[PDB]
Symmetry: D2
């Protein structure tokens, strides 16, 4: 509550904290108790346009795009140091807004620091290449330039984390940006803008728009002055964005959902498999893009595994994120909880079984909050919607498989391909499986490990492009081939 007394309630456009053009506002909720904890501006589409034009003017002036890469690196680094300095407050603020446990939030702040630090160090390392020209008396070189103006749109599950992944490289490369976080979770994003302002950037280089996607999203994807749209969210929105971006042939980077398999062989460390299955399915109430919602367990240990899992699920401590006992918090909103509830109806209707959970808890201390019980769904198959679609809640499905080939076939029988895992003490087997899985990230005997050093993104419909690592940086760069003819001669093709 203390955190909020000095926190800005406004958008940041062209170097000034400013209200919505129509002074409209929005109430921010704390999912633990559904109480309004803060009120922020609700920007208009004209505000978004003004920010974009500001980013363009700034980009063209060259104050940031022509700054030395080394210096750009030092500034991104300064932002990283600010995350660490205000680690505590930021973590609490994220837990307050999103509802996840405090330790999960501390972990984010550690990642975020490393994300900024990674890109800060990557800034001055590769400015292009020299080519051995196949034409005599010519010099051929490729120079990497910042792509230009970029719009950045994030989801509500991990607001600052997803923002760090976009901001760091944009700044490291010299781009100008316009960021818009999920309308329902802008607290940490506002805070980071306050921090970036302290670090100091040229007027127009960074901008923050606050508002509903349905209202200002189309401007951010479709305005002609935008050179790249980096979006992290739902698949249906991603498609809409791509279609809109096509109007001005605008580059896109999409980080969409997943139906991530968690493959468990009978030769896996059993207690390890159970631990990580619980983790994969219930961290942040399964509101994770890399969530292991699709468990694939080998028939020989399926029954044994289902029992062990269900027992553990019955003991999961639900509660307030600020409370150390809490193992799983609430889901983000009434709308989202309802979406999850309607999936339980869908699953039952198509023949699946709700082995445990699948309802709101009625325990007294949880009644006022947006809680939903950790759930396990059994007796399902690949043809069902509950198995194919991203529920994005504390829910997992269990499917059996006889052989290694069948496990692969099933893991890939999905429109998505973001991430997955394989558990087995036979490392050679796990390796074979990993090579055949059409997934952007594959974990062997682990789950949820991502880091700035390596690219993250999807195969198939989980996305287009990548974030993090060297490839992450590349989305914010464009190549130019400059060829100089050191001994120019007339071609004399046309008559004299």
């Amino acid at each position: 509550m203390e955190l909020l007394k000095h926190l800005s309630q406004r958008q940041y456009i062209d170097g000034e904290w400013v209200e919505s053009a129509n002074k409209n506002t929005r109430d921010i909720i704390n999912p633990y108790n559904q109480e309004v904890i803060f009120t922020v501006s609700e920007g208009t589409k004209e505000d978004a346009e003004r920010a974009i034009l500001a980013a363009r003017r700034a980009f063209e002036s060259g104050e940031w795009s022509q700054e030395t890469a080394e210096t750009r690196g030092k500034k991104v680094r300064a932002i990283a140091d600010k995350i660490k300095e205000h680690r505590e407050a930021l973590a609490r603020l994220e837990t307050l807004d999103t509802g996840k446990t405090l330790e999960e939030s501390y972990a984010d702040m550690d990642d975020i620091h490393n994300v900024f630090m990674y890109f800060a160090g990557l800034a001055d390392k590769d400015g292009g290449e020299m080519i051995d020209s196949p034409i005599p008396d010519t010099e051929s070189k490729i120079v990497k330039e910042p792509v230009g103006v970029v719009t950045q749109i994030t989801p509500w599950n991990y607001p600052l984390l997803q923002a760090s992944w976009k901001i760091a490289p944009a700044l490291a490369t010299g781009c100008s940006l316009v960021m818009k976080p999920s309308e329902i979770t802008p607290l940490t994003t506002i805070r980071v803008f306050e921090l970036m302002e302290e670090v100091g950037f040229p007027k127009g280089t960074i901008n923050l728009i606050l508002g509903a996607g349905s209202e200002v999203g189309d401007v951010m994807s479709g305005h002609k002055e935008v050179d790249l749209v980096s979006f992290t969210g739902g698949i249906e929105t991603g498609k809409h964005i791509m279609k809109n971006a096509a109007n001005n042939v605008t580059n896109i980077a999409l980080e969409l959902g997943g139906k991530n398999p968690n493959i468990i062989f009978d030769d896996a460390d059993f207690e390890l498999a159970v631990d990580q299955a619980l983790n994969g399915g219930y961290f942040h109430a399964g509101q994770v893009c890399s969530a292991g919602s699709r468990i694939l367990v080998q028939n020989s240990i399926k029954d044994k595994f289902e029992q062990a899992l269900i027992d553990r699920v019955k003991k999961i401590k639900l509660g307030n994120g600020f409370d150390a006992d809490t193992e799983m918090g609430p889901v983000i909103s009434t709308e989202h909880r309802n979406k999850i509830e309607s999936y339980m109806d869908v699953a039952k209707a198509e023949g699946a079984t709700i082995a445990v959970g699948g309802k709101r808890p009625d325990r007294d201390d949880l009644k006022d909050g947006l809680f939903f019980e950790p759930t396990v769904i059994t007796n399902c198959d690949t043809s069902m919607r509950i198995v194919q679609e991203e529920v994005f809640g504390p829910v997992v499905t269990v499917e059996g498989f006889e052989t290694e080939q069948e496990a692969i076939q099933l893991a890939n029988d999905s429109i998505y391909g973001l991430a997955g895992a394989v558990f087995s003490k036979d490392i050679g087997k796990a390796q074979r499986v990993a090579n055949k899985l059409k997934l952007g990230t594959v974990w062997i005997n682990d789950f949820f490990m991502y880091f700035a050093q390596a690219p993250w993104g999807g195969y198939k419909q989980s996305g287009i492009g990548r974030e993090l690592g060297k490839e992450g940086l590349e989305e914010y760069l464009v190549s130019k081939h400059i060829l100089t003819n050191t001994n120019p001669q007339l071609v004399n093709w046309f008559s004299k």
Copy 2:
């Protein structure tokens, strides 16, 4: 004419030369005299789908995708050797179909050979990277895999050249492909498929669909089994394709048009500037994506330059591509010539001047052909359509500029950004200019120089992605991060 007696008239699907599903056909024209010279199959949308499903089956069997990169390289190299072996016939065939001069066609065959040779040698050079994991007791690696099934669509101006740019990397990486050339120029594309078949590839690895984009194009961009659409064509079609590809969040590579500036300073080698201005504007009747249709000349030499240019334009030899005297051939079709003619009306209507040309030649020997006189348009400015839009004909516009900053501003005052040139003996100045031009390729004291060793593509609306060079190869690859935990421990987050 001899060339055509043994040339296939059919599509190539799943290892067999086959007719259209409805046995429909199309007549191919020779723009020099407008006579039908060949008849080919006109595929249906069901044929396109069948080819795509075939490419998928092939990709999944692994006969090509799992072949060693080294071997894949040897096969792409074998294709390169076939281009050189049949260099003569291919060149004649391209001149027959597209109408350009024979020497311009020989040049293509030399480039095409080098394109295949370049990618053949690039195939086994980079299979990913090893990462220094920030987490102890873990192994982190990134593997590059072929993206999967790719659809390739080409234009009519340089049919085989544009195809070579797509086929070479697709094959080098292990992808399966479905190619569809411009419905009006399929001759050389059919031939190269005959040649690739001789080299030998697994059933389904390569497929050729023949037909109108309006008929089968949507299947090639929108079918769910497609992992990448590589398109080279007009901007309006590119947007349509991107929008359609969005339905299954399909990657895209777009190589669209340009309004390429040819900047000439008063300190340029005058006779060199004139030579290259003629070249830039009239090679292949200005039907080149890199055509220098927008001449920007410095005011101090504008009048002198306009005279020199106009005199040379009056002497340009028009005629049959097979005739050595010929300097400029006809335009590709009655439809295209009409689009060009309507632009002359547009230009006159908006205040510009047709300083020379702007009409069909009435000379006896050219009357039956699709010729159009080389044209020079003066007294125009950046606000006019004739200057902003891609005419794609033997037409150039001349604009003056006082200073270096004004030249840059004008060169960039366009929705496009594919390529351009700068002429000046002050190499330092030319370099400054090159750095400020938002163009994918910038030539200093030269024009039209492109090659496999360097990436080609556009800034802004001239495209998305790149072709040729290492970046060209990357459009056909996808990254996977495989992280192994060599000493897995339970996290024990949840209760026991």
Copy 3:
């Protein structure tokens, strides 16, 4: 006295001409199977070596090859690769005739050599440097890769053409001029490849072949001031000598020396696989391989069982003529080398080891005239002995036990060398842990002898300096230049006007 030799040159190739030794001296080349003279070649002088080097310099400076486009240089290296394949059969027979190894082992080399030239042919036009984001405003910073210049290349006798391919390919791909000198006792295939390269066509002086003893012309090739790089593959004592001499003109060096390569076998290894590969590692080409698995480390729980299985197999190894399909192991290269091996048997016995099998010349009738030596297995030895620490380079292996994984690693690394080694175990996780702790340039897991152009090869510790093959291999033949242009120069005005 076969067909291959009737049209083969007997001379050096200097500055575009096949020429005799300056003093017309010559040398007789032997076939180790029967010790008969099969060919006579020129024996160059140190003045001939100097003349070739000066020729390489003149050629390098004229730019006809160093300024050719990388793409074209690639096409020419590719043309050489095609020639290796075209004359695959003859080259393989010629190598078997000169070195004594089996024909199939020679066919395998010709396949690698082709792929070596092909790899570098494709690598030639792929990386010409980098563009740097300058920390100084109004400046352009770029790094350009240039051919290092004149390079001398010296090879051993075990795999003459293979070792030559590894040096020639990158030198030519990069634009360097070279002077090659093969082992004085095995120049046949090297001469042939020069004939083939000449057919491909290169500028006068770009390639040169010197024939002669290292003791005579080697010092010129490592110590002449016009040499920019010495690439040497041979024995450790010669490598040291070369490095010391190269220091006179601060000349770069690339050294590919010997090894005491461990073949680690755990009790959870595929037993029959381990035995197969142990035999292979120790006896291919009579153990005359730089990557030979002469130091077998077997886990105590299966040591006795493994020693028996190995010894039985060794007793059945078919020795004979390389051209004969039955032959599994040929002779050693020379009387001198066989004597070196025999003296090691005395050393081993003297320091307490046991010759469990072999350790002598075979007296079988059909082998008496040849330079044969029986495949040998030495037991009851430990790391403190010379027979275990030093490179014997013959058909000899030592067997040592180890109790734990840490002890296997400690022993595998208890050596002055670090070229290559292997680990056998069905527990891939364990094999991976071990591989990470082995100070070796190449580590094989459940395999042996796998090398290829796509990956760098070379040693840790005293097995060498630098690398061959892969991108790093190419880099030995390149030098970096940083060109920094100030696009808006201002006076600094540090000193008084």
Copy 4:
């Protein structure tokens, strides 16, 4: 002023740093450190023995093998190198004064070093976790091929006296970023800033044995640092004759080497150059730090059409160069480092006169009253010389430049390359195309077009020919501290069955 300089020394260690402890020489022997401005002893430090060097090397080995640093995550190693960078900036002022006190160069030149050093550590800190090897597309089916980059192991690092901390930063940063253990030995006559940086690195915190500092004469402990068998790499920056000796000794255990030796760096000036700019940079190139710079532009090549005009402009400017104390703001050029070095320079003036050259200005000690007690030597210009002379071919390493004429572009290139060296050089001309042609033909590691002395961590530095072996700075700089390992796994092993059963 200079006072803040002497204060610096009251808290500075006087000892070697071996295996986590500040310790004296094994024989308690010591050495006096001089301030070249007045030749007064300003500090006394330990003078290590060869046994001390060996003990440090064995300590580095033990540490390397324990894996506390070599197995730390690259990311963390980066953070620590970054912490060192932050310490350079924090103590920027004191370090700069200390370097000026010890080496004699101006305070501003020292501030510049501290700025570079900070950036050097920062660069490598950010490079630490960026490339851990590559995955190869194996030509053999059912196999996985990967190349892992590992720290090379134990490294010995030896630096010169002209830019002590700068040359040390170039070696320490990558060694630490990569996970190597190191043993550093600075020039026996300039150990002040090197000792200080070790105090700072100790504060940052590193495992026992990871870093070690040996103090002593090269003639005494140098052979152990290059020839001990446990050393995996010797990184040396110094004179050519010492480099050759080191290489020869390193050969005993086939030990890798990185050598950064001298230069005879050409400063080429065409008649179409910005004349006043050419003169400014010619002065800079020849006299910064009294020409005691490895990249010094001691060989001026000026085009015949403007040679006479240039010689006069240069000489006039040389007569006005302000000599004095490094701590005094007026000072433009300080003294040379030692009586031995000044004598070496003086003997070169005799050499030049004897072989026919002309001492157009300077070539003597200044007799001005305030400079008499210091190791000063007048900025000198030598004319009427040619490529065959020793004064032109050899590295004088003093405030001396030679002027040679050239008629054509080809002649300029020929002369610039007529030298055993190839470290760096410059080209001045407004015709950028011409300057580019020239730059491509110069056998030099770094070539400046219309500038001089520009080096930075982002780009590799080193020589062609006898100016060295290997590179420092940039990605290539890091690679000297790494070794490649190819791990090939056969995922479906089969018996070869070559031998009978």
